[PDB]
């Protein structure tokens, strides 16, 4: 009988709500009221990068903190040189519709996809010298939204078919598959310890998965609309996400509930990308209204603004050493801020 | 030294990218939409993952994409097509049962934030089927549209055919002109199942879209 399961299900939900309410004795804002404010932070564009023909969605800083790869809808993957603004490589793609990009930890590989439903891996250290397609991973039914390298051999990708799958590049078959999401999966982020990872979907929920097991360890809720971004805290024990409700929320795995939310009356448009600083104190988020806002993660007061673009900001990344911040957009011009 | 190598690395790239700029702007991108019953499969086959089709008319290159491998939900990947020159929209006029769902889809595309500037070229297939269906007197546009009882013309076999076919066209244009500011238009056409003039019709409507862009930046409008 479905009714008894629903009656049993809602009873469990009521029990957990009391348990969460029991632990919800205080608030993060109340405790952090005695710390000094960071003040006003101003940032200026140091370098501007151009040659892209069409709009941009993807961007990722390499571990070397110098090279970075950006993908555009005209079918071109370009690797820059931030220090001296030099185009090192320009790879032509088979399918012009590309929605993601990545940079391998060892610097030897890059990856991308979109609507073609195929994950392509490119080799930048070929014996001949040119770049050729190393491998093509397929079985996904929907488009690809994000993909990250665990190492040279293992790659984890999320698709819009409401499932994520872990691949083995050498074998070319799904070693493990992740399910329970009912809506589209739009973004994921690997943990620092490379053991767990989280993915926010279009049903206002983010799930914590165990890579070794393949089962959803925990489920977090609280948003009102689609979730468009997510990222871990530097210590790996928390994450922050932005939604189309135009509010960012910080969750804690141990406390297993929302801690505090950043929002303002004047902001009525959703977030497209979020990221953290090296120390995690400053939370940078890109908005639809062509600007990025620098939030204080511990006080929620807006601390500065970055208003150098005249079109939607779609990507935002921070270097490993925390020396620079890059914010690509649909203008087709990237801009390295500092 | 290392500096000289970097300069040489660049110099070859801009030459290749410059030629890409030349061919890219020459071609026009079009997006094809319809339903399962709508004859978009027939229309694309008329002038013949994503199914690409390239056809050349009066030495201009056109590139049209058909995406059908996705799921029933389309509120996210539709945003990738905000740069197309126009959106071809095919509708079946001879089936009254699901004509309502077509109107709802058309309204959403028209008012979407990221597609406000994109013109729509509207095709109404199955006109031959519509002529036979009405003359039979089995189904009436009236039982699915009470407004038809009080409509007048603004086909030669019987004027009810003209009243019916124009009435369906009138419904689509009413949504178009109700919420607009002359930055994008609709171009309805009456096409049959077997016609060789579809390619020419797309060329003329694309031509008109370009002129209004060129005139506007030159301040003549």
């Amino acid at each position, epitope marked *: 009988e479905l009714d008894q399961l629903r009656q049993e299900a809602e009873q469990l939900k009521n029990q957990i709500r009391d348990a969460r309410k029991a632990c919800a004795d205080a608030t993060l804002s109340q405790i952090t009221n005695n710390i000094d404010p960071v003040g006003r932070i101003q940032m200026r564009t140091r370098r501007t990068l151009r040659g892209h023909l069409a709009k941009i969605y993807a961007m990722h800083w390499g571990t070397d903190s110098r090279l970075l790869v950006s993908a555009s809808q005209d079918g071109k993957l370009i690797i820059w040189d931030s220090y001296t603004t030099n185009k090192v490589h320009a790879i032509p793609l088979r399918s012009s519709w590309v929605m993601t990009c990545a940079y391998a930890p060892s610097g030897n590989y890059v990856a991308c996809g979109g609507l073609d439903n195929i994950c392509s891996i490119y080799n930048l250290k070929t014996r001949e010298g040119n770049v050729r397609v190393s491998r093509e991973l397929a079985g996904h039914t929907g488009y690809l939204s994000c993909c990250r390298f665990l190492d040279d051999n293992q790659i984890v990708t999320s698709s819009g078919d409401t499932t994520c799958a872990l691949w083995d590049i050498e074998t070319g078959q799904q070693t493990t598959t992740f399910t329970g999401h009912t809506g589209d999966v739009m973004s994921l982020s690997l943990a620092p310890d490379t053991r767990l990872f989280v993915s926010g979907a279009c049903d206002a929920s983010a799930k914590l998965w165990d890579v070794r097991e393949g089962m959803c360890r925990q489920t977090f809720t609280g948003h009102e609309s689609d979730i468009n971004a997510i990222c871990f805290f530097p210590n790996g024990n928390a994450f922050a996400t932005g939604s189309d409700d135009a509010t960012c929320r910080l969750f804690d795995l141990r406390a297993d509930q929302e801690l505090m939310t950043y929002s303002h009356d004047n902001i009525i448009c959703g977030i497209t990308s979020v990221s953290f600083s090296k120390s995690g104190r400053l939370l940078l988020a890109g908005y639809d209204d062509f600007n990025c806002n620098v939030w204080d993660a511990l006080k929620a007061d807006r601390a500065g603004v970055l208003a150098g673009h005249d079109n939607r900001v779609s990507c935002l990344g921070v270097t490993d050493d925390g020396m620079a911040v890059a914010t690509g957009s649909w203008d087709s011009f990237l801009k390295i801020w500092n | 030294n290392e500096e000289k190598a970097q300069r040489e690395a660049n110099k070859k790239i801009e030459k290749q990218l410059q030629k890409d700029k030349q061919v890219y702007r020459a071609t026009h991108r079009l997006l094809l939409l319809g339903a399962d019953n709508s004859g978009k499969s027939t229309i694309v086959k008329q002038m013949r993952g994503i199914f690409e089709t390239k056809f050349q008319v009066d030495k201009v290159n056109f590139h049209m994409f058909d995406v059908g491998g996705q799921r029933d939900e389309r509120r996210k990947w539709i945003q990738c097509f905000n740069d197309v020159t126009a959106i071809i929209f095919v509708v079946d006029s001879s089936d009254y049962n699901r004509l309502q769902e077509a109107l709802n889809l058309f309204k959403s595309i028209w*008012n*979407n934030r990221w597609l406000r500037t994109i013109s729509v070229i509207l095709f109404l297939n199955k006109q031959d089927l519509l002529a036979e269906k009405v003359l039979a007197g089995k189904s009436k546009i009236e039982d699915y549209f009470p407004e038809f009882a009080r409509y007048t013309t603004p086909p030669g076999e019987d004027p009810r055919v003209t009243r019916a076919k124009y009435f369906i066209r009138d419904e689509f244009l009413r949504i178009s002109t109700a919420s607009g500011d002359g930055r994008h238009y609709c171009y309805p056409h009456f096409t049959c199942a077997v016609d060789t003039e579809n390619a020419r019709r797309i060329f003329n409507d694309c031509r008109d879209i370009i002129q209004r862009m060129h005139l506007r930046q030159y301040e003549l409008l």
Partner: nanobody
Amino acid sequence: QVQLQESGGGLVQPGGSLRLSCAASGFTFSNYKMNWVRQAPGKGLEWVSDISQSGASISYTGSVKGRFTISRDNAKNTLYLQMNSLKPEDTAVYYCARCPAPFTRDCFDVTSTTYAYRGQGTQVTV
């Protein structure tokens, strides 16, 4: 979390009337455009009517004009539909969908098979 609970359906003789009410919780009701949808046996989802944010704009499907009236009370955060002179073909299961994103005037994917923000549904038979 977003939750929508429905009630009101039961057996009624032809030509009767029924009152359908849905309660919404977990979000600001005032900012969202609400819809009504139904599914007849052995058929796909069908659209019935919708109401704007403040109720200024109202629309109905052609097959039910002059028989159904849609109203919303933002104060108590509910949606309503009053049905009069029901026909034999009106039997179906009625769900209460909702617009996807806050503030836009477009309602994509509302009639999709697996829409996230939708109610459990109430059966109505004649």
